[PDB]
Design a protein around this ligand. Sequence first.
Ligand SMILES: *[C@@H]1O[C@H](CO)[C@@H](O)[C@H](O)[C@H]1NC(C)=O
Ligand SMILES: *[C@@H]1O[C@H](CO)[C@@H](O)[C@H](O)[C@H]1NC(C)=O
Ligand SMILES: *[C@@H]1O[C@H](CO)[C@@H](O)[C@H](O)[C@H]1NC(C)=O
Length: 401
Amino acid sequence: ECSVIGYNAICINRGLHQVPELPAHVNYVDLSLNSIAELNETSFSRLQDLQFLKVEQQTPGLVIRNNTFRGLSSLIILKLDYNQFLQLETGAFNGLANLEVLTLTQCNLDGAVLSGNFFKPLTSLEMLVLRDNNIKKIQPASFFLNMRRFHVLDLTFNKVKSICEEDLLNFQGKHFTLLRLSSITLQDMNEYWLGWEKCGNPFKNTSITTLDLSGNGFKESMAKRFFDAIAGTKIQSLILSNSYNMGSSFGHTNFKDPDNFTFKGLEASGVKTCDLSKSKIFALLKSVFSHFTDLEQLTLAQNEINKIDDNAFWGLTHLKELALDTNQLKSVPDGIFDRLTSLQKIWLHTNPWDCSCPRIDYLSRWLNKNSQKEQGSAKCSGSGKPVRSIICPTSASLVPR
Ligand SMILES: *[C@@H]1O[C@H](CO)[C@@H](O)[C@H](O)[C@H]1NC(C)=O
Ligand SMILES: *[C@@H]1O[C@H](CO)[C@@H](O)[C@H](O)[C@H]1NC(C)=O
Ligand SMILES: *[C@@H]1O[C@H](CO)[C@@H](O)[C@H](O)[C@H]1NC(C)=O
């Protein structure tokens, strides 16, 4: 009951229990949402030309036998997502020497998938998506040393209590363009952990373009330790959004805003963009950012910021883009932006600005001189006029009668 148009065969949701007879010339086959219970060598022995195979969400318990993919040397993308309780025989992916993307989201997989030989045949793999599985420890087997182009790994929504040097030993040498460690908790990596000395540097001799550690809490004391531990790792862009424990509270005394020591390990990482948006930061302290010496973009949007110290931004001479919107700022100190000499864009909107004079004098004049840089429009609380338009009267002694 498939729809075969040209090189494409769409067999989505047709109540199939086996791979159906398709024409031998097809290169794109989608068999998602069916009742196929097992895939073996005879499953694709007539579809030898496939480039894109998709077999998502079968009825639960799909088994993939040894040599199912023998001689699909043309297959580049294989998607096996949402297959509850997936069973892989350990030579399941034999033959796939040219495969570049494998996605296995939500298949109840655990660490064995990365530590056994399941992925050994995949010498060309660039992109491995393993979201929302049950991986507790990221422990890649030794063949990963030889996957020259493995560069994208997404582990979002696994619960991984820690990441350590000896865990990631076979990722040493890699350059990851996207190492996505989002929403994995890193529960054990905190103030109270005795395992820090032994953990070392999970990223020893590894480089990263985008390191996504969002949604993992990152209380100030955890960030410090974590970035000391990975001190010196080349990272181009650092995502720490939804660091739900970052910032201070009158409620729990322990908790503090990040300081000039917090991000010191990132000193020589060459970070170009840093996202700390959507967190709980209440104050920007002296020199908190003074270690990102190559920083070009910084977002602190949607925190709870209501205090910016003199020198919050010391050492950000290369910064092009700064976002401070949607906080609780009534004011900023005089001259706070003066040494941001590469500033191209700034966001200051959705803050309750107090436009009393002479408090608002510096920000108003600045926002006017730099109106081409302001994205959106910071407004005065109460009146709702733009802060750009406020001309403060001058103090009487400066213009004597
Ligand atoms: C493969 O699977 C089909 C049914 O799914 C079965 O009839 C056939 O004998 C199997 N062949 C091998 C080699 O496992
Ligand atoms: C499948 O292939 C592997 C790896 O080479 C082999 O050791 C294993 O015994 C095979 N398993 C089965 C169940 O046939
Ligand atoms: C890892 O170490 C080697 C020296 O052993 C070095 O030359 C190389 O650039 C490093 N690789 C990465 C990706 O940092």
